[PDB]
Amino acid sequence: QVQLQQSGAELVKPGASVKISCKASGVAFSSYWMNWVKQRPGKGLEWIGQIYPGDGDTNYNGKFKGKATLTADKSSSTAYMQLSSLSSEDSAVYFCARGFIATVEETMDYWGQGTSVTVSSAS
Amino acid sequence: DIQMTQTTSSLSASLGDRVTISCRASQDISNYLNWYQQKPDGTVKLLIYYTSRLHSGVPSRFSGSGSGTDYSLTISNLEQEDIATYFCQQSHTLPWTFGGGTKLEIKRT
Amino acid sequence: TNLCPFGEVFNATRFASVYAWNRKRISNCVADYSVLYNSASFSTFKCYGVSPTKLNDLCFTNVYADSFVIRGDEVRQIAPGQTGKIADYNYKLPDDFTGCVIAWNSNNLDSKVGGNYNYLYRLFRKSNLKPFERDISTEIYQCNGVEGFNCYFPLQSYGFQPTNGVGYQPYRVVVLSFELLHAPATVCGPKKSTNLVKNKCVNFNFNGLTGTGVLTESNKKFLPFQQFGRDIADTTDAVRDPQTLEILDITPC
Ligand SMILES: *[C@@H]1O[C@H](CO[C@@H]2O[C@@H](C)[C@@H](O)[C@@H](O)[C@@H]2O)[C@@H](O[C@@H]2O[C@H](CO)[C@@H](O)[C@H](O)[C@H]2NC(C)=O)[C@H](O)[C@H]1NC(C)=O
Incomplete structure (x- = not known):
């Protein structure tokens, strides 16, 4: 079955860096775009970025350019997302989706379970 | 980037009634719009692509229409599991944007 | 299929x-x-x-x-x-x-x-x-x-x-x-095939080859790759049913 599984919730101190893995099972992971999307609670979806595992082609949103880094792992078929210079506003739910092509456009057909990341200094 | 707007932030409807969710775009995007549905638990799945194509496994009670800069998703008969949040996302220009999302409720206080 | x-x-x-x-x-x-x-x-x-x-x-x-x-x-x-x-x-x-x-x-x-x-x-x-x-x-x-x-x-x-x-x-x-239409057919749409009728003047469509005539049993022995039969007049004489492998002669009405 086409399954996109992600890691659990993350607790990150501000200013640190965090890695999120999205692993694809039952998919030719190296032939379709991986789109990463951010959702703050009560706010609309924000398209963070997109990577092509086949050759490492990446397209980054202007707002998130440089802040987030996307890498591919062909062997384990996993897309890694690295967040640097975390602040409290970055606390959100991050989704990984597959960019299928309907011969005219690109659509995010299959979506992951979503990783909740919270940035704070509480115990 | 293309500005994506949903006029109705939320709406309440009864079971089995046709429900229309609008989506207005700042710039013409032809019919390069996708409708996604997110369950209250957080699970999200594709619903409609290219504004009229029904995705695999999706009940036929859903439909899409529109052109130019205005589109709409229509539920012919609302059912209990259809209660979710619907997002319209463009694909005309590379910085893709999602709508504000519309949440459905039952007619009650 | x-x-x-x-x-x-x-x-x-x-x-x-x-x-x-x-x-x-x-x-x-x-x-x-x-x-x-x-x-x-x-x-x-x-x-x-x-x-x-x-x-x-x-x-x-x-x-x-x-x-x-x-x-x-x-x-x-x-x-x-x-x-x-x-x-x-x-x-x-x-x-x-x-x-x-x-x-x-x-x-x-x-x-x-x-x-x-x-x-x-x-x-x-x-x-x-x-x-x-x-x-x-x-x-x-x-x-x-x-x-x-x-x-x-x-x-x-x-x-x-x-x-x-x-x-x-x-x-x-x-x-x-x-x-x-020069070799055994390999790719084409549904054109859902019906039952085959013999010894009666009917129209026929076999692997795109269309015609009208009477279909009869024949004793000609084509090669495994051979599909169509022809005369000196270059007309279609015998064809092999794609579904089941036998040869049928065509006679004009
Ligand atoms: C291009 O692909 C579509 C498939 O639609 C989706 O494609 C992927 C996102 C996949 O993960 C699934 O979610 C969908 O199937 C083809 O259109 C449909 O294809 C399916 C085959 O499974 C078929 O059942 C439907 O009837 C097709 N039509 C619609 C309106 O859904 C399309 O045919 C593909 N392009 C070509 C040229 O074949």
Whole structure:
């Protein structure tokens, strides 16, 4: 079955860096775009970025350019997302989706379970 | 980037009634719009692509229409599991944007 | 009964460059191309050897699909008997070309804000290339190394920015080629076959071969690959039923 599984919730101190893995099972992971999307609670979806595992082609949103880094792992078929210079506003739910092509456009057909990341200094 | 707007932030409807969710775009995007549905638990799945194509496994009670800069998703008969949040996302220009999302409720206080 | 994909031909997240046009073979399927009328609303969809509507009633022996991406205003180069960089240096069709051409705008998919660089094309070449010929070699054409006076790099990439006006936006092109009615059929649409009737004047359609007559049992012994029977008059005498393997003679009414 086409399954996109992600890691659990993350607790990150501000200013640190965090890695999120999205692993694809039952998919030719190296032939379709991986789109990463951010959702703050009560706010609309924000398209963070997109990577092509086949050759490492990446397209980054202007707002998130440089802040987030996307890498591919062909062997384990996993897309890694690295967040640097975390602040409290970055606390959100991050989704990984597959960019299928309907011969005219690109659509995010299959979506992951979503990783909740919270940035704070509480115990 | 293309500005994506949903006029109705939320709406309440009864079971089995046709429900229309609008989506207005700042710039013409032809019919390069996708409708996604997110369950209250957080699970999200594709619903409609290219504004009229029904995705695999999706009940036929859903439909899409529109052109130019205005589109709409229509539920012919609302059912209990259809209660979710619907997002319209463009694909005309590379910085893709999602709508504000519309949440459905039952007619009650 | 098999359904050949048409997915990795059309539904592909990254088409190849024109100079390296991707070639695919399709065989042994119920090619229900009926999706291709309107599943994408192509800008150009033109067919030479047969009208697109009639294509559901023709059975082929081989189907080849060529997928690539070309500059917008250059789509007209894809027609047979044309001239120019695209039609002479990296892709050419025969004059008697059959099969047909589909092309649709793909500005959103292929264009990049900073200028796409995956898509290349051959600008310099020693001489024109024969139809359906692919060249990938990247030596320097008119000189050592890679650069110099008249020592120019053969391949250049379109600056596919989204802001480019119509005629510069990248267009995705898929070209189908298939032979008509000389070999055992391999690819064609449903044309759901009915029961076969013998010794009665009926019309018949066997693997695209259409006619009218009376079908009778025959003792002629064709070879395993032999399908059609012919006379000195070059008419169709005997044909072998595709479903079950026996030979039937045809007699005019
Ligand atoms: C291009 O693909 C579509 C498939 O639609 C979706 O594609 C992927 C996102 C996949 O993960 C699934 O969610 C969907 O199937 C083809 O259109 C449909 O294809 C399916 C085959 O499973 C078929 O059941 C439907 O009837 C097709 N039509 C619609 C309106 O859903 C389309 O055919 C593909 N392109 C070509 C040229 O074949």
